[PDB]
Amino acid sequence: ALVDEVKDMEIARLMSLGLSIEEATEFYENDVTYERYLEILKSKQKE
């Protein structure tokens, strides 16, 4: 899907894990889509 609503839903997924706003959106898309970045971020951020 290519609607702006996809971007916004995947961004709302960022808020559920705990992230920024506009930088969080760019990060989400540059890391992947959702579940793949969650796995990489859980590797990162110790303590």
From Swiss-Prot:
Q: Where in the cell is it found?
A: Cytoplasm; Endoplasmic reticulum membrane
Source superkingdom: Eukaryota
Question: What residue stretches are annotated with the UBA domain?
Answer: 4-44
- From which residue to which does any coiled coil extend? none
Function comment: Cofactor for the uncoating of clathrin-coated vesicles (CCVs) by Hsp70-type chaperones (SSA1/2/3 and SSB1/2). Coat disassembly is important for fusion of vesicles with target membranes and for recycling components of clathrin coats to the cytoplasm for further rounds of vesicle formation. Binds to assembled clathrin and recruits the ATP-activated chaperone to CCVs. Stimulates the ATPase activity of the clathrin-associated Hsp70-type chaperone SSA1, which then disrupts clathrin-clathrin interactions, leading to release of the clathrin coat.
Extra info from the record?
Present with 768 molecules/cell in log phase SD medium.
Comment text on domains? The TPR repeats and the J domain are required for interaction with Hsp70-type chaperones. The J domain is responsible for stimulating the ATPase activity of the chaperone.
Q: What is known about its subunit structure?
A: Interacts with the clathrin light and heavy chains CLC1 and CHC1, respectively. Binds to clathrin with its N-terminal domain containing 3 clathrin-binding (CB) motifs. Association with clathrin is transient. Binds to polyubiquitin and ubiquitinated proteins.
Name the chain's protein: Auxilin-like clathrin uncoating factor SWA2
Which species is this UniProt entry from?
Saccharomyces cerevisiae (strain ATCC 204508 / S288c)
Which gene is this protein's source? SWA2
